[PDB]
Design a protein around this nucleic acid. Structure first.
Ligand SMILES: [Zn+2]
Lengths: 94, 362, 80, 107, 98, 95, 108, 81, 98
DNA sequence: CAGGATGTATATATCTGACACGTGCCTGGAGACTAGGGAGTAATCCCCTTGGCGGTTAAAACGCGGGGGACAGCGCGTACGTGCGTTTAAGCGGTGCTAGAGCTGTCTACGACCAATTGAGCGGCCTCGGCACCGGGATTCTCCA
DNA sequence: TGGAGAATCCCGGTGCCGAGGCCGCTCAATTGGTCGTAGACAGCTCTAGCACCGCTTAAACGCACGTACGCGCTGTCCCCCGCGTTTTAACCGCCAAGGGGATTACTCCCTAGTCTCCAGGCACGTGTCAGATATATACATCCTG
């Protein structure tokens, strides 16, 4: 009667994709929740600041891409950017 | 008449007598080769030969002048791409690898170029066996149609050894295998978990080339798991030991493999049939087999005929499942023409009705 | 009501072991008790501030997680 | 005369939710407006990072002959990676433990 | 005679044992008492969720382990193996907590 | 065209003449004072935003600013800044 | 009608602008609504802190026989006070210099 | 441009050390200091150029530098803030 | 004979001189060249405002001074007066930059 | 070295409670449509960044002598580790109670929005006085008998 | 405990450019009113923190013995520092050209807002199997005669 939402459904789907015989504890599924929320807040705050620096009013894919390039180190940013651009490109083709 | 079969099995044991000396000499040169490949500086630093045994039950072998060994190579984070949606051939890519991939020169863009890496393998192996000439050993280069580098040794006379590169991955036994290795109700679930925590292998083989990227396709290999299960072939893992009861599983396996070997070579039209078909069928027969009493050498001939019945029933309904990948069932007409499978059936009729005359050789 | 002597000497030796320490002088215990007291005082001051602002009486796990996150010591596994 | 729904995560080809991320971006005081391709990008990135961590964790799990991932395995995955350990350098994982190391001089 | 171990072997065994575990190395009732006593200066008649005390304990143990690592580094730097309050003071001064 | 810009120079100068009726200020020091005011404005405003978000609210009030000031400033700075702020709001609401 | 205007900082009794702070709070994406007493509090606190810095800075400028504050005096003020040094602990001041300090072990 | 890290002369590292309060300096300190300065500069200029590219400009302004420093915990007063 | 000063007096005089100034202690043209060379890897044909190079120089000099302070502390800790690369490495390892 | 003692990784047998599905349903996300304003673009100005040249002098660079500090070696003595027998209090299981968190409904005061006035703060212009900067003499401070 | 070199503070005069004040104006804050909804109270439920009581046993504690490690002293030998000479290249003043930042005007398309509808994700309930625990072995390592 106090419905509260999380990310565990999608974390579990991803797990069944990468390791389709492995489970997860109940504390690891809390740690992954905290991790997703932390990274979300980081990326979103940096994109907000980026749009404020350039006198814009909207947050677009370009702000998210620049925020990802600012926050992730080294080869993490290259792969994350490729993932994002592939996803957006596939989405617009509909 | 299991005595005639038993003495032909003894005959196989006399190939074995010739082949302990032949196999030891080849093994020794390859072993020296192995130690030499691990010291030289190249992308092949840690390359073991993967041991699946030496026995006929364990290795590729035919007429005494041809041997096979498996060389394994551990590979970094690998991502597979299904190319034959049957589920038998793959493209290989990498993942992030933050430190560095010491193989990027072997890739065409994002896909691993098997051809280039194999070319480097061939070059390095030929040069290295060329750099030490104790035993008269040379390299032969045949058509680039099946990627195997065959050494010819003149000691005592022609010894051929096809060297097959195999990549080793430790990751997860990909999803195409998810309901492979079904033994849970036969041996147990604890073994299956343990077996499936082992690594798996990818071997270069160009799936017939209705495709652009050639060589760049790979097939799955589970040679180590297969050797383990076969050498603990029984519901009682005590099989083939003094601690347990000798059964007729291995005898039937040798009987069908060699019978087929002789019949297929004497009628060369049917060469699309490979030794893996017999292993897959016997895997299915041993897993559905609930009874240890269904395998005992005094009933060798009856179990073997039952196996023949199993073989015809597998043939009949147009599918023979890959024991590790049920989604890839190799008994598709597109790789074996229907008439040829039935022609083999006719040959089976031929063998079955004639009282194994092809065995009346010596 | 000292309660700082309840962080015993074997417990401090165990914390030192987990950190890769082989030998330990005898004046390390009284110093690390003070260090721990300072750290706890800071974190609990901030947690109680977060608690009073919500007009609550109990300190929850989220107050602690926020007080930690605002000192550069993010903690995973207790919500958030 | 409807167009029976097709989730945005399905169009993007993702497992993470695009509409929930859109809502969280709008009701979070980040900007006045939010573009149409921003939640798609952000959910793709979150899914990439999640998969990247979970794979190294399942590897550490199945090394110790385990089936379920525990926090120790997440910790071993984070700390044995010079980039994920730079992204989470000042994060503490509950029940995670430390990485085993002894200084050479102490042996 | 029986089996006197030489000074430094049980210490290495304990290092290897506690670098492999994940438990909490401080007793829980004393820590809880200490937390309540510290907090009764900022506001009286407080209450604590169990998760709050567990979070505080996890954070404090992580802090102290991470500080003992730098203390050990400073000791090694000074051509020693015993850690002394000088090393804790140097570590906390370089880290910026002073 | 000339693109008017804002700064806190007028108010910093008034405060200076009110605390030191004889001293002047350089221009680089005035730049430093502008950067300082912008910095701690941002700090307090972001902390109060987070506070309002944790507690399900949608408004920033003087209570949020009070507790953000108690979280950010150390020791006696917080005590005196809270006294100043409360005194000012009391005077203001009295019109 | 329309009695004479009166700035909000005049009523509050401050020298910092309450209207500009209200606008900067309403345009900075901090919350949906901004109460009426929040910019007054915030301007009072900003004014307190700037006067607290400028007093020490003018003292440092006077102890050098100078009538004009420069960045060096701001740095001296900040680094010498114990509470302003915890607030501005991770800040670099352009043309500020350091605090003259030699370790005792190095003296002759 | 090549071999410009050598323009951080040794008599200048000595002055930075004097301002840092050090009395006697080894002879291997200068290469260490050049390497440290080079990695610091790389880390700051990468972020300043990311900001610049996002703004679609071709000159690096002082605000790009101030933001790149602020996002690493090295806030700098006096250049726009 | 004339006025040989003993080793360590001009060093203390320089300490007192440079702890009282506010100037920049690195030449400006070499620093600007170094900055442009470093930046020509991330994007070619860039331009710089003078204020940008001045900001970079101020930040870098503040960083290096603050690091030499901790290097000196580590040297004093190790019962020395000469600073060595060991001390820089210890300082940057404790601070968390490694 | 070579045995001897101890500790640790390794196999089985048993039981449990925590994880993985499965079901019911409600709330939040999707489909379709409209209306405005933000952003993309094109053109134009004019600032300021880059490039060059010539002279000067300050700083860097190179050499050299020597003294002081880093570093290795040797001895001693004491403080810390290891092991054992006592003793204290932590941990676990169970019971009872009530304070306080969490939610729900009502309503009222408070903050957004808008339209018209008007003064505060910004940009530009001008001027003197605070502060570099050079001389020139006073007075500290270091280095030896 | 002196006395002389040589930095360093202190006073004095000149001069220059930047801070401080004035003026004109425009746009952003104030005043006055309306409206809708966020949040403040008032009640009620029922979770979960707090206080207690036995009981077992694991961990803390205190003590003794001995050894290895910290610390102090001595001695040598490089290697950094202080000074002097040479050279090189920053720095300052200057002029020139053009790239690109910054602003304006115009138009369109992209996003917010609403309304209707239905499926996905949440809460609750089972069922069973991965893992925790206990016992028995075998291999690995440290230590001392
Ligand atoms: Zn058998």
């Amino acid at each position: 009667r106090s419905r509260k939402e999380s990310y565990s459904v999608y974390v579990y789907k991803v797990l069944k994709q990468v390791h389709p015989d492995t489970g997860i504890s109940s504390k690891a599924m809390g740690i992954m929740n905290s991790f997703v929320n932390d990274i979300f807040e980081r990326i979103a705050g940096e994109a907000s600041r980026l749009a404020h620096y350039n006198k814009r009013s909207t947050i677009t894919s370009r702000e998210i891409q620049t925020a990802v390039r600012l926050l992730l180190p080294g080869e993490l940013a290259k792969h994350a950017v490729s993932e994002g651009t592939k996803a957006v490109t596939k989405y617009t083709s509909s | 008449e299991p005595d005639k079969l038993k003495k032909v099995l003894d005959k196989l044991r006399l190939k074995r007598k010739d082949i302990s000396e032949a196999a030891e000499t080849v093994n020794k040169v390859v072993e020296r080769l192995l130690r030499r490949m691990q010291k030289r500086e190249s992308e092949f630093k840690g390359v073991e030969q993967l041991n699946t045994g030496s026995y006929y039950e364990h290795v590729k072998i035919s007429a005494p002048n041809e041997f096979d060994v498996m060389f394994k190579l551990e590979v970094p984070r690998i991502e597979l791409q299904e190319y034959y949606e049957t589920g038998a051939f793959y493209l290989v890519k990498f993942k992030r690898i933050p430190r560095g991939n010491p193989l990027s020169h072997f890739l065409e863009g994002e896909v691993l170029s098997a051809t280039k890496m194999l070319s480097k393998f061939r070059k390095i192996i030929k040069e290295e066996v060329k750099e030490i000439k104790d035993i008269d050993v040379s390299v032969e280069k045949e058509k680039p149609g099946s990627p195997a580098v065959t050494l010819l040794i003149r000691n005592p006379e022609e010894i051929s050894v096809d060297i097959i590169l195999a990549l080793e991955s430790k990751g997860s036994w990909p999803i195409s295998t998810k309901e492979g290795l079904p033994i849970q109700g036969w041996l147990g679930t604890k073994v299956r978990t343990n077996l499936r925590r082992e690594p798996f292998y990818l071997v270069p083989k160009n799936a017939k080339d209705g495709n652009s990227f050639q060589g760049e396709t790979w097939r799955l290999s589970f040679s180590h798991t297969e050797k383990y299960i076969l050498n603990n072939h029984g519901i009682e893992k005590t099989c083939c030991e003094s601690s347990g009861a000798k059964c007729c599983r291995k005898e039937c396996l040798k009987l069908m493999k060699y019978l087929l070997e002789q019949l297929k070579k004497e009628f060369q039209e049917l060469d699309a049939f490979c030794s893996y078909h017999v292993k897959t069928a016997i895997f299915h027969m041993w897993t559905q087999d609930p009874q240890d009493s269904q395998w005992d050498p005094r009933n060798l001939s009856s179990c073997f005929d039952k196996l023949l019945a199993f073989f015809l029933e597998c043939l009949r309904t147009e599918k023979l499942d890959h024991y590790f990948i049920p989604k890839f069932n190799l008994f598709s007409q597109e790789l074996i023409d229907r008439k040829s499978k039935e022609f083999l059936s006719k040959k089976i009729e031929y063998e079955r009705n004639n009282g194994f005359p092809i065995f009346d050789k010596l | 009501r000292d309660n700082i002597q309840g962080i015993t000497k074997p417990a401090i030796r165990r914390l030192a072991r987990r950190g890769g320490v082989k030998r330990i002088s005898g004046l390390i215990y009284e110093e690390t008790r003070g260090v721990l007291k300072v750290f706890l005082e800071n974190v609990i001051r901030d947690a109680v501030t977060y608690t009073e602002h919500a007009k609550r009486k109990t300190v929850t796990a989220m107050d602690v997680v926020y007080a930690l996150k605002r000192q550069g010591r993010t903690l995973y596994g207790f919500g958030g | 005369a409807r167009a029976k729904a097709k989730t945005r995560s399905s169009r993007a080809g993702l497992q993470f939710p695009v509409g929930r991320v859109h809502r969280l971006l709008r009701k979070g005081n980040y900007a006045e407006r939010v573009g149409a391709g921003a939640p798609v990008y952000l959910a793709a990135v979150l899914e990439y990072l999640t998969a990247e961590i979970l794979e190294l964790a399942g590897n550490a799990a199945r090394d110790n002959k385990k089936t379920r991932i525990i926090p120790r395995h997440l910790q071993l995955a984070i700390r044995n990676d010079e980039e994920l350990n730079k992204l989470l350098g000042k994060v503490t994982i509950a029940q995670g433990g430390v990485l085993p190391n002894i200084q050479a001089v102490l042996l | 005679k029986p089996h006197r171990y030489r000074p430094g072997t049980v210490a290495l065994r304990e290092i290897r044992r506690y670098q492999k575990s994940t438990e909490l190395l401080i007793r829980k009732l004393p820590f809880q008492r200490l937390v309540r006593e510290i907090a009764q200066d900022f506001k009286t008649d407080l209450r604590f969720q169990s998760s709050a005390v567990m979070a505080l304990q996890e954070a404090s143990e992580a802090y102290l382990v991470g500080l003992f690592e730098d203390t050990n580094l400073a000791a090694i730097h000074a051509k020693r193996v015993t850690i002394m309050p000088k090393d804790i003071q140097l570590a906390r001064r370089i880290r910026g907590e002073r």
